Amino acid sequence: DIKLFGKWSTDDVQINDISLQDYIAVKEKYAKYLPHSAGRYAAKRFRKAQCPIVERLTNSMMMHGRNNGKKLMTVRIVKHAFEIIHLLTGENPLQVLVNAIINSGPREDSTRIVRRQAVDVSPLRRVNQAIWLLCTGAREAAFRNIKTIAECLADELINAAKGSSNSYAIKKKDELERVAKSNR
Amino acid sequence: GHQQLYWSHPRKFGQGSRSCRVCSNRHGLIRKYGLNMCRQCFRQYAKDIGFIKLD
Amino acid sequence: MAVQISKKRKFVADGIFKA
Amino acid sequence: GVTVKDVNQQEFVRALAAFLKKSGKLKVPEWVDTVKLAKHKELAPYDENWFYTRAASTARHLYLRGGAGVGSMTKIYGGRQRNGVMPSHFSRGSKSVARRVLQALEGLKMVEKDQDWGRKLTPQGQRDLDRIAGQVAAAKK
Amino acid sequence: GPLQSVQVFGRKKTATAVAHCKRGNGLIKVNGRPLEMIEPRTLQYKLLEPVLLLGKERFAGVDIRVRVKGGGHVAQIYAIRQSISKALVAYYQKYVDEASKKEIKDILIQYDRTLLVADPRRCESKKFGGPGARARYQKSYR
Amino acid sequence: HRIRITLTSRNVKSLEKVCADLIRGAKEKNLKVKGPVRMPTKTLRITTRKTPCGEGSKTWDRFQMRIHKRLIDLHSPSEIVKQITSISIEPGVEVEVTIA
Amino acid sequence: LNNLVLFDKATYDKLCKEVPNYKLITPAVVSERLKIRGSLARAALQELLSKGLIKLVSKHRAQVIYTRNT
Amino acid sequence: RFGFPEGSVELYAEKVATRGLCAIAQAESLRYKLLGGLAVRRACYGVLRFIMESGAKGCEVVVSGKLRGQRAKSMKFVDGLMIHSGDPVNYYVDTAVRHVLLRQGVLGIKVK
Amino acid sequence: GRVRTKTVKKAARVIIEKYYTRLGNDFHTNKRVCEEIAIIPSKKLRNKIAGYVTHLMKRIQRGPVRG
Amino acid sequence: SLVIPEKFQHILRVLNTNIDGRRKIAFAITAIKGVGRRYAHVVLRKADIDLTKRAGELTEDEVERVITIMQNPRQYKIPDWFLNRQKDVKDGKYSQVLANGLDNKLREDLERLKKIRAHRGLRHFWGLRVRGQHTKTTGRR
RNA sequence: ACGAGACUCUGGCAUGCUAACUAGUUACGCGACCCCGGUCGGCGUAACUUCUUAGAGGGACAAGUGGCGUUCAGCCACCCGAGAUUGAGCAAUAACAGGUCUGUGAUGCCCUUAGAUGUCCGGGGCUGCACGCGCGCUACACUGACUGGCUCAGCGUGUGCCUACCCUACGCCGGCAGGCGCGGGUAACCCGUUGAACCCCAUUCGUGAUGGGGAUCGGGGAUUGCAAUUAUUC
């Protein structure tokens, strides 16, 4: 039968990047009705990868202390965000999320192997870093602002998927890759 | 009189009323389940009372 | 017993006697 | 045929609150204007006619479970006492406003003080509750 | 007619939910209120998932009363999610062929394992020297 | 005639041996017996500091004392129970016979 | 933010003109782009639905989301 | 003392069979040997030799306190199999601790 | 860290060495062999021994074992 | 209806205190020292006033009604348990005391405790914590 | 050989076993309400033990499969499965100039021993504040605060030896803190189906030290106690 949140039917969405295709779990098998589930995705190592990215986003939203274990409250934020994304863009909000996760992941980053040499990233690292960056964008954007979380989360996902560099996520991603080129 | 002053200050409540039933001292009292027995005494006699360390 | 002590207190009182 | 439990409970109290308004024979106190609804509230209830609303809420709380006295009502209408700088704790509601609400619903033959203590909800009440449950069940279509 | 009742439970935490699969028409409700108004409404679809994945036609011949107590809001939702699922699988074991029960177990397990298997996770015990299980009180040097 | 024996003990195997002897004592004499009801065992708990002073790392001992309650109902005359309950008890168990 | 509390003639005429041509109508959007307080913007969008100009998508305790018709 | 009625408490005084495997019997034995005026080393070997010949699997006799001067010294007398950890330490090893007042201080006796 | 201790292996070797012909390759049958031909006070240790017994029986099927 | 009306008073001067017309009335009167959120709400409840209006909108004959009920709360049935000076030391009257009066009555309360040379008044005189705090580690200006 | 592991307790599994008016469910009857059915922790009795309690057993072993590895110990992945490292308790030899003489009718020596360092009574002190440090609680908000509404726990404890001092339903008075009656429970029986908070839903608010924050300080009212001032607490 037919899926997501009521109204954002999964298959439709293309994952453009064949590199992140495996670890952006959105389609066909991971089509579930909520961003909520029992869990066990952080028991074994890569079990994280087989978690639906909308649940990953929901989990990574509840941060800066006061929100910890208010999942239903960020299930709601992502619901209202997907409303705003569809109305403001006119695309399938899942497609906008997937495009953002692709464009927001830093493709190589510096590390301490001195003056810290540059290395490559895991595709899972990119997904983890992408989700962190655009959530940390949404969280910072909304703080001491009349704009809400669902609006800031929507606008971050749009401007990231769009490829704007006006987003927090794309500016920090460009900034990591720029430091990585600066020591390769 | 002296008998009107000797024990006339109340001993009805507070840790100046109840005392250990071994040590006779006024500190670290286990009042729970009417032990009325200071924490070092209980830790000595636990085995003899029926209290056992399992978990 | 006429005062009728609690079973929690009774088994502890039985231990204190043995001690 | 429907009952109150089949109906959404959120809009049910607002509909019962409007039923007690239109009926208009609860004998509300005078201090309703001045009273704060618990010891853990900061401000007066925002809705001026709260007494009808909590009467409605008490009514359907008595329907769901019987034999609830004043102390029980203070328990169900309790929350956080935000103790300023000290950590917040559970705090019971007002004993008086629960006692008056029950006495209002007892005056108007809707509840009846039950054997072995507490008020249950009289069959005339159970009727009125289920009649407006039908109204709300019909309204939501 | 005769008794075709199966009483099967589901735990997802310290919340035990027991569902009661009698013969009849398609009414599914929990402590006497139907699934469409069990709060939070945020997890509305979580109760409908066994009803959605199988369809109303599976629950046409069966009516399910669910008693729930223990745990909290989300635990009770996952408890009843597991109960009505396992209870229908238990009804279709005994009172029809195992072919239908096999077919339905497959469709449920393929979607989410937790529909028919209880999560053994329980709240781990606090230890002294910290506010909880693993976390310790702040060590002070100098 | 409805006589209610309350077996409360610290040890289980001594309490299970006593309640097993009182089922054999009720089956051999052929009087109708409601089975031994396992009551919820009560864990009496004391958590003290180990240190008699205050000057170590704050270690705690956690003294449990489990008390197990059974109870058995008999459909027996009074003097028959007086004979049964007086035979073969072991000092761990506390036995309280309720007449009515 | 030196916002307005109730509407002018200008800002009321600006709202009644421009708001029903937005693909995203939230009180936060209205209360940024018309230099007004959130409460005034929520009251304004209640009247614009009352007169039947803006489409409701999802109302919530936290955030209401409206849009435009055609 | 305990408020028992008239003759509703009656005492017996039975005999310890194989008293070499009773811990507090060999603790008080060692206690009254030292207090009697016997030397520490001879007493401890004397107890340890008896409880071994009594048929005990293993034994550990510690005597702590002020020996042969001002400084305190723990003389430990071990032989045979002795366990320390796990649940079996409850129902295999029999431990006893006793004080003894010498004219210089207090010695402590552990018979395990 | 599922390394068998000396108490498991010594027991498991002696159990094969003296009662070879009673054993097989199935865990659950020679679990009940170990129950009969030895007095093991633990259930966990019984399983550990039965488990390593079966491992050594698979090794003996391949070729001769050093111990 | 949601447009700025005529004579919409931005800066009101009630008891020589600048009330913000931009605020809601129940939270604009609070600007006056001696009236808090809980008092203001009950004052505006006693007078039949819609308290969903801003403090700029409402009529100057009606704000004079608000002042008269703040100044004389007893005569419009506000209880004695509700006032910031209950059972006064010099006149023995239950009265709400407002901004310029409150600053006068605080000065008088400290000056009363001062002249009698009481431990409380002495701690005020020395600029220390008076309600029985520990001054070892806090009060640290 | 001790220590590790084994062991003990505990978490997770049993529609198999043993049983229950101080625990339930399901049927049936009765009674209430809605238009045959639905609701009922309204009332009672007939089976059963899924739910509940706690006993005996079982169950998991790197056991099965594929890889890696002296092809040894073992390791990685996967199936089946309630678990494919539950969490604690216990704890070796040999130590420390670690802490405790203010835990003890454990104690050596020393001091004091009637103008007492014994002991009781009264008051004060342990809280005293330019300051420096440590564990914390509350915050800085709109992932929020306020006001209503809605709906879910699990450990426990509870009327005493001397010993006074228990946990409390329910009914009236009071805004509240609280008061006065009468009940139940020495407890799976009563509080209690522990109607907990967060969370959930609907109002008010609007980026302003703001309805954030609730320090400080004035006035009043109750409770515990022989006594609250240096504000006991509320």
What does this entry show, briefly?
The structure is cut from a larger assembly and holds ten protein chains of nine kinds. Chain E has helices at 45-54, 73-94, 98-111; strands at residues 6-11, 15-23, 28-30, 33-34, 62-70.
Task: Identify the notable features of this structure and list them briefly.
part of a larger assembly; 10 chains; B: 55 residues; alpha+beta; 30s Ribosomal Protein S14, Chain N; two-stranded antiparallel ribbon; 1 helix; 20% helix; I: 67 residues; mainly alpha; Diphtheria Toxin Repressor, domain 2; 66% helix; globular; RNA-binding; methylation (chain B); structural constituent of ribosome (chain B)
Describe the protein's architecture and organization.
The structure is cut from a larger assembly and holds ten protein chains of nine kinds. By secondary structure, chain A is mainly alpha-helical. Chain A has a single domain, classed as Ribosomal protein S7/S5 (Ribosomal Protein S7), CATH 1.10.455. Chain A is 47% helix and 3% strand. In chain A, strand 1 and strand 2 form a beta hairpin. Chain B is built from one helix and two strands. Chain B has one helix at 39-49; strands spanning 29-30, 37-38. Chain D has 141 residues and is mostly helical. Chain D contains five helices and four strands. Chain D has helices at residues 9-23, 50-64, 70-76, 95-107, 123-139, and strands at residues 79-81, 89-91, 112-113, 119-120. In chain D, strand 3 (112-113) and strand 4 form a beta hairpin. At the A-E interface, helix 2 of A face helix 1 of E. Chain F: It comes from Oryctolagus cuniculus (Rabbit).
SS-derived structural category of chain D: mainly alpha
Strand order in space, largest sheet of chain D: 1-2
Structural class of chain A: mainly alpha
Radius of gyration of chain D: 16 Å
Largest Cβ-defined interface = A-E, 13 and 17 residues
**Count of all domains of chain D:** 1
The name of the CATH architecture of chain A is Orthogonal Bundle
Proportion of residues in β-strands of chain D: 5-15%
| CATH fold name of chain A | Ribosomal Protein S7
Total number of beta strands of chain D: 4
Major beta-sheet overview of chain D: 2 strands, antiparallel
Q: Roughly how much helix do the residues of chain A carry, as a percent range?
A: 40-55%
- The termini of chain D sit apart by 15 Å
Main sheet: strands, sense, barrel of chain A: 2 strands, antiparallel
PDB class: ribosome
Keywords: Israeli Acute Paralysis Virus, ires, Small Ribosomal Subunit
Entry title: Structure of a mammalian small ribosomal subunit in complex with the Israeli Acute Paralysis Virus IRES (Class 2)
Chain A: uS7
